[PDB]
Amino acid sequence: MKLVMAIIKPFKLDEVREALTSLGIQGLTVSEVKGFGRQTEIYRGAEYSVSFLPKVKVEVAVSDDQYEQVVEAIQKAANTGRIGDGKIFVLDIAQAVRIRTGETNTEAL
Amino acid sequence: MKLVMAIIKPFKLDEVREALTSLGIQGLTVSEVKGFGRQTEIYRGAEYSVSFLPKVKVEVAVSDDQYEQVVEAIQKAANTGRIGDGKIFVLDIAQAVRIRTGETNTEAL
Amino acid sequence: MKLVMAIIKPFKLDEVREALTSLGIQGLTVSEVKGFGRQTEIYRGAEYSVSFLPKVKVEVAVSDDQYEQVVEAIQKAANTGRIGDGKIFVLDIAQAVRIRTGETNTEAL
Ligand SMILES: Nc1ncnc2c1ncn2[C@@H]1O[C@H](COP(=O)(O)OP(=O)(O)O)[C@@H](O)[C@H]1O
Ligand SMILES: Nc1ncnc2c1ncn2[C@@H]1O[C@H](COP(=O)(O)OP(=O)(O)O)[C@@H](O)[C@H]1O
Ligand SMILES: Nc1ncnc2c1ncn2[C@@H]1O[C@H](COP(=O)(O)OP(=O)(O)O)[C@@H](O)[C@H]1O
């Protein structure tokens, strides 16, 4: 099992969701985040960040047989070719549980 | 060390916290998230998500000796038996640091 | 590759960003979170959390050659020596992709 974590432009969320649904992946968790990457105001000694780049973090747990296709689908849907498109990170999941049923691992996803 | 990540119904957060406290686990980090799983409006070409399912993400770093009990306690407390109860994912933590002291690994948790 | 996840006091975010920039790390993702660690109101049977400790979660993907220095820089910048300074967790990243280009792994970071 893998956790696919994507940081994308907020306006690409619906396209990414659609691409994942077409793969049979409809369960995902979305977080609002602030990005720093490629305005500040100096107040009482230090530089203070006064503007931020909004991004969306998409997290989806998927099987080892699914993860490569999921990464590909997110990359293709979230791409603009312009700066700030974001990143996809894949991490290993050791164990999973479906809270409603107690089902575990692949059967929980 | 393990990172236990649970996505739960917001109204179950206090019950989950209480269950973890009873185990001697009081340190945890909570994020507000949006869930997609088991309303849209069509505007200028595409389907736009106009409603979301609020969920809470609970993240707690725990020792290898603790994680199984923690997963069990969260599952039991967050369960309703109804759709949308959520998921628990366990991931491996390679290293941990307590910022205040520089303590590492188990002694940081 | 490693994902360095730090939970810090919100007023330390700019100092942490500056320390990371000095290392040549400018890409990071920040989340607003609620902390529980070291007020409640009883309503209709149960204890309800009515106050929360705001924290910031900093997530930065870095190379195996960089991660130790990154952990050190965050710890030093975020430290006050007072309760609540927070935690740093390091997790393994299996794969990474830059959405704009399709670049992978170290070249994506
Ligand atoms: N190494 C990293 N770790 C964590 N988040 C990152 C990293 N690099 C980029 N990000 C996230 O991706 C966003 C885009 O990064 P940026 O360098 O601006 O564009 P690009 O990915 O096209 O080079 C950032 O705003 C940040 O949220
Ligand atoms: N594979 C997954 N990856 C990430 N988050 C998920 C996944 N499946 C479910 N979730 C999260 O759990 C919530 C509940 O999922 P859902 O399928 O609606 O109910 P159930 O878990 O009872 O089948 C979703 O709203 C989403 O936040
Ligand atoms: N085991 C843990 N897992 C996840 N988050 C934690 C853990 N311990 C602490 N935290 C986060 O770090 C914050 C500070 O923890 P606390 O125990 O209050 O102070 P200190 O880290 O100085 O002992 C908490 O509010 C919470 O957000």
Side-chain angles (χ1 to χ4, degrees), chain A residues 1-17 19-33 35-37 39 41 43 45-46 48-71 73-81 83-94 96-109, chain B residues 1-17 19-33 35-37 39 41 43 45-46 48-71 73-81 83-94 96-109, chain C residues 1-17 19-33 35-37 39 41 43 45-46 48-71 73-81 83-94 96-109:
Chain A
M1 290 175 290
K2 309 290 188 262
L3 184 65
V4 180
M5 183 178 84
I7 307 302
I8 66 175
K9 293 174 171 167
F11 61 74
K12 280 296 197 167
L13 175 62
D14 274 310
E15 292 180 33
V16 167
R17 175 176 55 76
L20 295 175
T21 291
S22 295
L23 279 177
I25 329 265
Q26 286 186 274
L28 61 141
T29 297
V30 176
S31 306
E32 306 302 298
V33 300
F36 298 84
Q39 311 213 282
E41 188 172 325
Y43 185 69
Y48 205 89
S49 295
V50 300
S51 76
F52 299 94
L53 309 192
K55 302 294 175 183
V56 155
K57 176 199 287 196
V58 173
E59 292 173 297
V60 59
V62 297
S63 73
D64 292 337
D65 292 324
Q66 291 175 309
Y67 87 93
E68 294 165 85
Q69 292 150 100
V70 166
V71 171
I74 296 174
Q75 182 188 337
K76 182 176 222 282
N79 175 271
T80 68
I83 188 60
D85 277 355
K87 304 293 167 86
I88 306 166
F89 306 122
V90 181
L91 296 94
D92 300 340
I93 294 175
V97 179
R98 189 192 305 274
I99 295 176
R100 178 166 50 88
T101 60
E103 282 161 300
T104 60
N105 304 329
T106 33
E107 295 181 358
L109 291 198
Chain B
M1 290 175 290
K2 309 290 188 262
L3 184 65
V4 180
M5 183 178 84
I7 307 302
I8 66 175
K9 293 174 171 167
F11 61 74
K12 280 296 197 167
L13 175 62
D14 274 310
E15 292 180 33
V16 167
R17 175 176 55 76
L20 295 175
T21 291
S22 295
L23 279 177
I25 329 265
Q26 286 186 274
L28 61 141
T29 297
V30 176
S31 306
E32 306 302 298
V33 300
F36 298 84
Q39 311 213 282
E41 188 172 325
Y43 185 69
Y48 205 89
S49 295
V50 300
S51 76
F52 299 94
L53 309 192
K55 302 294 175 183
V56 155
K57 176 199 287 196
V58 173
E59 292 173 297
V60 59
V62 297
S63 73
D64 292 337
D65 292 324
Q66 291 175 309
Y67 87 93
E68 294 165 85
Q69 292 150 100
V70 166
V71 171
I74 296 174
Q75 182 188 337
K76 182 176 222 282
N79 175 271
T80 68
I83 188 60
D85 277 355
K87 304 293 167 86
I88 306 166
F89 306 122
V90 181
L91 296 94
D92 300 340
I93 294 175
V97 179
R98 189 192 305 274
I99 295 176
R100 178 166 50 88
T101 60
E103 282 161 300
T104 60
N105 304 329
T106 33
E107 295 181 358
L109 291 198
Chain C
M1 290 175 290
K2 309 290 188 262
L3 184 65
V4 180
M5 183 178 84
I7 307 302
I8 66 175
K9 293 174 171 167
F11 61 74
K12 280 296 197 167
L13 175 62
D14 274 311
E15 292 180 33
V16 167
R17 175 176 55 76
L20 295 175
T21 291
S22 295
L23 279 177
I25 329 265
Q26 286 186 274
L28 61 141
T29 297
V30 176
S31 306
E32 306 302 298
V33 300
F36 298 84
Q39 311 213 282
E41 188 172 325
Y43 185 69
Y48 205 89
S49 295
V50 300
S51 76
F52 299 94
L53 309 192
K55 302 294 175 183
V56 155
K57 176 199 287 196
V58 173
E59 292 173 297
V60 59
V62 297
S63 73
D64 292 337
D65 292 324
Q66 291 175 309
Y67 87 93
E68 294 165 85
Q69 292 150 100
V70 166
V71 171
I74 296 174
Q75 182 188 337
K76 182 176 222 282
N79 175 271
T80 68
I83 188 60
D85 277 355
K87 304 293 167 86
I88 306 166
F89 306 122
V90 181
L91 296 94
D92 300 340
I93 294 175
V97 179
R98 189 192 305 274
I99 295 176
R100 178 166 50 88
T101 60
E103 282 161 300
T104 60
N105 304 329
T106 33
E107 295 181 358
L109 291 198

